[PDB]
């Protein structure tokens, strides 16, 4: 077939897939694809901000 296996890929195919993954994820929790605003992104970024703040503090401690 086609699409199967470990073939080569490009950077536009990587973002393209991440778009379909976000769109299909909300369809399971909100039952609509309108995606007026994308709350999944923001909730994920907030955790990344939390982790970064934790790393900055303990690196600050090591400097001390």
């Amino acid at each position: 077939g086609s699409g199967y296996g470990l073939g080569l890929s490009t950077r536009t195919q990587v973002t393209g897939y991440q778009f379909l993954a976000r769109r299909t994820a909300m369809a399971l929790t909100r039952w609509r694809v309108r995606m007026e605003i994308e709350p999944g992104r923001r909730q994920t970024l907030a955790v990344v901000a939390s982790v970064s703040a934790a790393l900055v503090i303990c690196l600050g401690a090591l400097l001390w």
Partner: protein, 50 residues
């Protein structure tokens, strides 16, 4: 790298072992900005608009 070599020749040996984590993370942080980063004026397309 010159700064680290200059301190090591000076004999401080402060950067040995775990102390090395400071030069290491900076070198990596510079690497991200120069090779990836974002496109210029002739590269208007980007994840937020595409």
């Amino acid at each position: 790298g010159g700064m680290v070599a200059m301190v090591f020749a000076s004999g401080s040996h402060v950067f040995g072992g775990i102390g090395s984590i400071f030069p290491l993370f900076m070198m990596v942080g510079i690497m991200m900005m120069m090779f990836r980063g974002m496109g210029g004026g002739q590269q208007q397309m980007s994840r937020p608009k595409l």
